[PDB]
Structure 1
Amino acid sequence: FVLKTPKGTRDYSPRQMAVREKVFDVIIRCFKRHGAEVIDTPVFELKETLMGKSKLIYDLKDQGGELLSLRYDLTVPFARYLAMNKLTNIKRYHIAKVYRRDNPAMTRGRYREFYQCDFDIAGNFDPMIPDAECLKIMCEILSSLQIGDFLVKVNDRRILDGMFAICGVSDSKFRTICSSVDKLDKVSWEEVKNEMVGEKGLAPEVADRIGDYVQQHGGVSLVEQLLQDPKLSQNKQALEGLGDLKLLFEYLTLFGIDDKISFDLSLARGLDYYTGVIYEAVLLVGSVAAGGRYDGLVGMFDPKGRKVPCVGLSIGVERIFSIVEQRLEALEEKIRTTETQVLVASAQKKLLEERLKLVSELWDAGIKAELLYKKNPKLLNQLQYCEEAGIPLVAIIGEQELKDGVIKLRSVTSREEVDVRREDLVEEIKRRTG
């Protein structure tokens, strides 16, 4: 029996937490800015509230009561939440850990306990207004994370269904083809079309009309050409998604995100799920944030079986975590794990108690202070501490520096001292720091 965290899990270190924290803040400063409420749900649900999912699910023992299972997702509790409270409309974010008993990467990428960060807008509203706001939030959050330049790929579920019908894919073969054509952003058409014909058995004449569509991508100028596409122009499903997309584009221009988006017919994911728009944000590579509209899901716990038209986004905080901490190992830099702002020190040999008086004073003034938990600390060791923890200042008490009612404030980085009076010390610290 080794001391270890269970297969697929991980402790968050003080360094990692410090990085994880600055990411969440930016993400939450944005959600709050859009007037979103927040809910929280328990870690486990009734074992069978989660039926109708892949059964890569942590199930608890019996141990007495009923059968239970750790949440593999945030949205099933969400749909349980809206039903247990009889809500037809809400705007929430929810940040918590989900549990999928899958095989942990060693390269890496995948964990069994990982953060999920979702934002949602449930309810019946005018067409694409809540759909357009979700894009604005991503681009706000991503741009504010300072992690490089990004693009948002956009597509509609109906344009997919219509395109595959008018091109001629069988419904039973419909969805391994989506799973295939979705690989276009990591691979090439040649290989897609090739993997394809070997595994599907589509007519090569079905594979290559798909290619004339899915290989295309661009802006609104594309959604207008696709309307002019004669065979698409008489597919009812394709015409809706195209309509809903032209409108969606018009709103983004008003948001000033018009160019940070690309309509990409190759995008085809989460089809158990999305019924309208589908979103995915990529860096400039890798999938960093997703989302879209899913109207037939949240209401699937309602008595009379009422739809709850819902749109929303998820953010790959786990991926963004890794990027930030390497962009802080890029400068090979100490991430500050504390917010300590002053260290009460002394060079003399019996002043321990006089320090304690000063720290509580600093504390009760709302200043983040600290002292070494020893009776006669040497000033050299005291300073290394600050240098290590990135503490900006040191407050040195001396006997003949106590006598005149003052305190020595030595800046750790500039090594410069200046005598400050007890009355002005806290003011000085609150100015030499934010």
Structure 2
Amino acid sequence: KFVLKTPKGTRDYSPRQMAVREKVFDVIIRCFKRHGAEVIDTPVFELKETLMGKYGEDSKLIYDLKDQGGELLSLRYDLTVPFARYLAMNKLTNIKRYHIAKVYRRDNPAMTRGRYREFYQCDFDIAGNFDPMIPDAECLKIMCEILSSLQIGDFLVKVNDRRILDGMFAICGVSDSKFRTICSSVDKLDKVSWEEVKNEMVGEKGLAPEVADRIGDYVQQHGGVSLVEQLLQDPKLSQNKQALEGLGDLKLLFEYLTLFGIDDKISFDLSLARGLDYYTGVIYEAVLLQTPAQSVAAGGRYDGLVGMFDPKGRKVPCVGLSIGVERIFSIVEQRLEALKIRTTETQVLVASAQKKLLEERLKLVSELWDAGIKAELLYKKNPKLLNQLQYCEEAGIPLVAIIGEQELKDGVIKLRSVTSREEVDVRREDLVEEIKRRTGQ
């Protein structure tokens, strides 16, 4: 019952999958850099106490390391808490960073295909005291740039504010003590019925039926900027100062989103409440829409988190986003299967048909390596030429440099195109340039 296997909910990345990974990360990183972000990295684990008391009910899904006599450690559940720890530890107030790394969650979803316990997040976060809603709006612009550039079909970004959500709960009659647990039930509305949620709130979490009904009247609503204006003219909700400020900030957000040319991509949705306790202002999730045949990014503002870490409680406003690339890898692979990607970049194979020429091949391949050319040879004393061409056909190697007794005497090499099969004599001094000229370089 030892079996060769990766741990439950984790996968290797094959060369083919790594090719796709690099392509997706390249689009994402090009965008993060375009917005002037620094990059950092943190250890894979933190102290156990670092991650406790931050996430909410999801804290039950953290991987702990064994108590081996030393410190109690835990694998990072996301990149944001480590970011807040980095800020506080270094006493920083202002930084704009991106971070691309794996995170660790003991999930148990119904779909067990793919990497559901160890998966990459691509984060971008702006920390600092700035004027209202500008960095918030930029985060939404970054999401839309990226999702558009990846070309993974049409998408929509749902938006809300935790102040609106919690103020709406107050008007409906939810006590302040239940804001987190009721907000948690509303987060399930993307997977379950309203009836199933309503029953959870009444039967299990102890709400009254009447107030759950009232929550439904708001939660079902979604639209654009006109909905914000509507709710500002709402008689009941306008009397809540908390909600009033959140709505006022979303009004400002939509002004900036329009100037960024992405107001058409945003849905103000009152059912959106994120899964994590630390959000204080805006929150958002992007979802892919279906074209006829048949969440991919998320984030928000979290102004309290660095304060929990600072010795003297000093706060540092932060807003950010994270892109879930695991779904995207499947989609991008399916696009390429629809249109043969290589997993090496070898430009040439040094080869020979005759015997007793391994030494000369090693000389030549090394010469090429020293000139920066991507070169290989078969690890054989006297390989057959047919096998050498087959190795190239399968790898996608475009050229073969063939050595023979006579060619060494003459100071040339036979250069054959793997795809056309045409062969040309090339002077050994010219070989490097000729290879570069043929392979894009």
Asked if the contact 2:76/2:104 (under 8 Å) is kept, the reply is yes
Supply the distance in 2 between the matched residues of 1:20 and 1:385 (Cα, whole angstroms): 25
Supply the distance in 1 between the matched residues of 2:152 and 2:439 (Cα, whole angstroms): 27
- The alpha carbon displacement at 1:413 in A equals 2.5
- The alpha carbon displacement at 1:290 in A equals 0.5
Q: Residues 33 and 382 of structure 1: is their aligned pair in 2 closer, same or farther, counting only changes over 3 Å?
A: same
Matched residue, 2:390: 384
Q: Deviations over 1:205-226 (max 9, x none)?
A: 4344433333222222222222
Q: Residues 65 and 175 of structure 1: is their aligned pair in 2 closer, same or farther, counting only changes over 3 Å?
A: closer
Q: Residues 38 and 360 of structure 1: is their aligned pair in 2 closer, same or farther, counting only changes over 3 Å?
A: same
Asked if the contact 2:378/2:388 (under 8 Å) is kept, the reply is yes
- The alpha carbon displacement at 1:171 in A equals 3.7
Supply the distance in 1 between the matched residues of 2:129 and 2:21 (Cα, whole angstroms): 35
Q: Residues 382 and 47 of structure 1: is their aligned pair in 2 closer, same or farther, counting only changes over 3 Å?
A: same
Aligned-partner SS, 2:308: coil
- The alpha carbon displacement at 1:372 in A equals 1.0
Asked if the contact 2:155/2:288 (under 8 Å) is kept, the reply is yes
Asked if the contact 1:104/1:110 (under 8 Å) is kept, the reply is no
Q: Residues 148 and 392 of structure 1: is their aligned pair in 2 closer, same or farther, counting only changes over 3 Å?
A: farther
Q: Deviations over 1:361-410 (max 9, x none)?
A: 32222221111111211121112111211222222233444454433333
Aligned-partner SS, 2:307: coil
Q: Residues 401 and 336 of structure 1: is their aligned pair in 2 closer, same or farther, counting only changes over 3 Å?
A: same
Which segment is superposed worse, 378-387 or 113-122?
A: 113-122
Supply the distance in 1 between the matched residues of 2:269 and 2:430 (Cα, whole angstroms): 62
Q: Which has the higher helix share?
A: 2
- The alpha carbon displacement at 1:164 in A equals 2.0
Matched residue, 1:323: 331
- The alpha carbon displacement at 1:299 in A equals 2.1
Asked if the contact 1:7/1:104 (under 8 Å) is kept, the reply is no
Supply the distance in 2 between the matched residues of 1:72 and 1:193 (Cα, whole angstroms): 29
Q: Which runs of 5+ in 2 are unaligned?
A: 290-294
Q: Residues 183 and 60 of structure 1: is their aligned pair in 2 closer, same or farther, counting only changes over 3 Å?
A: closer
Aligned length: 430
Matched residue, 1:8: 9
Asked if the contact 1:14/1:337 (under 8 Å) is kept, the reply is yes
Asked if the contact 2:306/2:314 (under 8 Å) is kept, the reply is no
- The alpha carbon displacement at 1:193 in A equals 5.0
Aligned-partner SS, 1:395: strand
Q: Deviations over 1:220-256 (max 9, x none)?
A: 2222222222333332222211111121111122222
Supply the distance in 1 between the matched residues of 2:47 and 2:177 (Cα, whole angstroms): 33
- The alpha carbon displacement at 1:355 in A equals 2.2
Asked if the contact 1:58/1:70 (under 8 Å) is kept, the reply is yes
Asked if the contact 1:8/1:104 (under 8 Å) is kept, the reply is no
Supply the distance in 1 between the matched residues of 2:158 and 2:68 (Cα, whole angstroms): 48
Supply the distance in 2 between the matched residues of 1:104 and 1:429 (Cα, whole angstroms): 51
Q: Residues 177 and 350 of structure 1: is their aligned pair in 2 closer, same or farther, counting only changes over 3 Å?
A: same
Asked if the contact 2:46/2:74 (under 8 Å) is kept, the reply is yes
RMSD across aligned C-alpha pairs, in angstroms?
2.6
Matched residue, 1:213: 218
Q: Residues 105 and 386 of structure 1: is their aligned pair in 2 closer, same or farther, counting only changes over 3 Å?
A: farther
The normalised TM-score by structure 1 is: 0.89
Asked if the contact 1:134/1:313 (under 8 Å) is kept, the reply is yes
Q: Residues 419 and 223 of structure 1: is their aligned pair in 2 closer, same or farther, counting only changes over 3 Å?
A: farther
- The alpha carbon displacement at 1:188 in A equals 5.3
Supply the distance in 2 between the matched residues of 1:418 and 1:189 (Cα, whole angstroms): 72
- The alpha carbon displacement at 1:295 in A equals 0.4
Task: Report the identity percentage.
Answer: 100
- The alpha carbon displacement at 1:92 in A equals 1.3
- The alpha carbon displacement at 1:176 in A equals 4.3
Asked if the contact 2:347/2:398 (under 8 Å) is kept, the reply is yes
Q: Which runs of 5+ in 1 are unaligned?
A: none
The normalised TM-score by structure 2 is: 0.88
Supply the distance in 2 between the matched residues of 1:429 and 1:149 (Cα, whole angstroms): 42
Which segment is superposed worse, 355-364 or 239-248?
A: 355-364
- The alpha carbon displacement at 1:312 in A equals 0.7
